[PDB]
Amino acid sequence: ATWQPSASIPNLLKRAAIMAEIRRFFADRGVLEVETPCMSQATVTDIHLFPFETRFVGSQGINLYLMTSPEYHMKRLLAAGCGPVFQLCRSFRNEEMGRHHNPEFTMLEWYRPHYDMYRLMNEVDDLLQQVLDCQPAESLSYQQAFQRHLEIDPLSADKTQLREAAAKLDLSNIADTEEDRDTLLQLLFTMGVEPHIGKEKPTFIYHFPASQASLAQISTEDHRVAERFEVYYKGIELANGFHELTDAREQQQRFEQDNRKRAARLPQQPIDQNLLDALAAGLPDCSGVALGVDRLVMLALGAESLADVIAFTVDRA
């Protein structure tokens, strides 16, 4: 019956125990928990993100946007001096329900002032070991991953070389006509690399190409890559971490470029001036990470979809 929960009672008890462990993990490291809004008068500019919008009575209401990630408010807190902070929030992305996506989901996001990407990866690995009781993670660069799995260099290979690889994977249909080099790299990573990682233990992939920087600063030593990592385990994308952007002008260029592209494609998005204002005042150098709690719980239970770990997925909420 559609009235019943999506997840079993035993799975929801284990869910609460994991949430408690996560909280003990950060308590033990002196990391403060914060709560930030689920709604903003501003939204994100990323072309790949689709925000929920709702009207607030505010005689003239205010448009509000549900938060795809608590990043901007947490950076505002950091700029104001909160120190190392974590949050376990409900996040909202207007995406269809899938085995591994729900339009509302639990995010674990945290920030560590004065931590570089490597020190943060190590902390994420310790958390995985604790919750999953899994082995210590392996780490490799995006480059190394391609070289080991596909015998190509993704930082230097031309599109012909790229389609040669795609052909070997039985992917020529999609690859032959695709003329965007980075898009071909994503096809190859998804189809040629992802199936061969995260098997025995979690796998960190870091130094994604500059085009796939997302929230990451570009690597100063090699502008071809970004200070971003992603963790994979048993075929599941669990987390993305970054050496965060502290430069206001650089951040603003990102948003403006985003809205310029959206126009070329999508509505232009109300920029978070509050975030740019925080960066102008001064955000401590930091690395931050966003982890999918529902996926973590799914893996900890050996469950096969989010419907097993979320009380009511959107189809019956």
Next chain:
Amino acid sequence: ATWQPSASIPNLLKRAAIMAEIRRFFADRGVLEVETPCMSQATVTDIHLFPFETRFVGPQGINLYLMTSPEYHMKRLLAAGCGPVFQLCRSFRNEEMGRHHNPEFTMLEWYRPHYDMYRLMNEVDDLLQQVLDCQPAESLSYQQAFQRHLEIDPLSADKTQLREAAAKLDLEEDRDTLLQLLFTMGVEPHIGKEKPTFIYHFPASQASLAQISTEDHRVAERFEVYYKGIELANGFHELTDAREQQQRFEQDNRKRGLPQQPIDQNLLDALAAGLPDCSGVALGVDRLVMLALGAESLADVIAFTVDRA
């Protein structure tokens, strides 16, 4: 500058300690924590509530409503066997920001199978004493509060009698609306001064989620807690009968120049399947934290209120 949080660093650190204290309270009592949706294909019919609505792409699109409280999903869990459970969630009500309101706010809602209203009140009192280091609560009925502060009986006074009383307070054709004005203006400023005040047995018309008292049909098994001028919690002996719940929703819609809301069948269906006898309570965590901090507004304990979020 607008970029800065509403709440100070010290207040947020104290807020987190309180969150963890609430969790310790329930852990010590073996109550399970759950998480239920912030969004639903269904909504509420309650005449006092204004939800947010937002459009979902779907598996074409679907209208979603944000949750005003986790009640309906927690009842579904209860009907499925979850046992005593609490939740600390963000709840959503489409109403302007005020000193004591934000359109998104933290709710502590919990449910106790086999607790009556009195046993639940006692448990609320214990939590308040823990968080606030306040004195044990006093309790009185809606009737007693009107008798002690206004010298009238709200259960039997006629409208003339009521207007006379409103006249004496230096202040409408509905008797219940009259009672509401009297309570807000004549009773509320005069309770919760030195310790939390539990008001119980609200009139039948103000039943909200509560069963009617079987022993006196003029009143409901509902209580409200007030402290230092502020409304902190609402608790009920819960409705378990599907037929009665549905008639209440039908009536809700009748009373609604407000839009008519659909009745949530999943809730009714859970009630049909069987909801254990239980009492539940909804508490305003931000309000509670504000009182713990001796602060004046929610802007002092919420990292970013809506005006700057």
